[PDB]
């Protein structure tokens, strides 16, 4: 019930919004996952510095090597890109 | 600016709320991280089923083996516990 829970459920709210047309399976492809980064991580793109960290992400996604990326892989790639900005707390 | 961004910043808002007394370093200990699970993941605890997945988490945290857990390790342990409930979308 804390403010965080409100946002925890939101994450599902938005992850389902994109995959609500069928949701038949429970897997996401890198090609569609990237597009999600273009409209979901485009705002933080300004507050980043280790451009070389994001550079390896766009190469790690393109190098899915698995044919299908699950939600666990989305919560990780989302963290690296967010944590990529060392000391994000210093918002300025 | 999407509803998700609002929650992305919230995550930082709450992660900083606990570590605002000093924030001198940027590391979190497992002993204090666990306590965060007791007041941050206690709500979803009801919507879980793979009790054996959470069981290994409480053992993985206690087995930090690293002396200090960073924020990247918190976004991962938080995902497994959340994703532990296979098909969380089926909220009922």
UniProtKB/Swiss-Prot annotation, chains A, B:
List of residues binding Zn(2+): 16, 26, 86, 91
Entry keyword Repeat: yes
Result, substituting residue 26 to A: Decreased zinc-binding
Keywords noted in UniProt: Acetylation, Calcium, Cell adhesion, Cytoplasm, Metal-binding, Nucleus, Repeat, Secreted, Zinc
Superkingdom per UniProt: Eukaryota
Binding site for Ca(2+) 2: 62, 64, 66, 68, 73
UniProt-annotated location(s): Cytoplasm; Nucleus; Secreted
Disulphide bond pairs: none
Induction: Up-regulated in periinfarct ventricular myocardium.
Listed Gene3D superfamilies: EF-hand
UniProt domain EF-hand: residue ranges: 13-48, 49-84
Modified positions (N-acetylserine) in chain numbering: 2
Entry-linked CDD domains: S-100B
Pfam families, per the entry: EF-hand_1 (PF00036), S_100 (PF01023)
Outcome when changing residue 91 to A: Decreased zinc-binding
SMART domains in UniProt: EFh, S_100
GO CC term, one of those recorded: nucleus
Single Gene Ontology MF annotation: signaling receptor binding
Gene Ontology biological process: adaptive thermogenesis; astrocyte differentiation; cell adhesion; cellular response to hypoxia; learning or memory; long-term synaptic potentiation; memory; negative regulation of skeletal muscle cell differentiation
Quaternary structure and partners: Dimer of either two alpha chains, or two beta chains, or one alpha and one beta chain. The S100B dimer binds two molecules of STK38. Interacts with CACYBP in a calcium-dependent manner. Interacts with ATAD3A; this interaction probably occurs in the cytosol prior to ATAD3A mitochondrial targeting. Interacts with S100A6. The S100B dimer interacts with two molecules of CAPZA1. Interacts with AGER. Interacts with PPP5C (via TPR repeats); the interaction is calcium-dependent and modulates PPP5C activity. Interacts with TPPP; this interaction inhibits TPPP dimerization.
Protein name, entry field: Protein S100-B
Provenance organism: Rattus norvegicus (Rat)
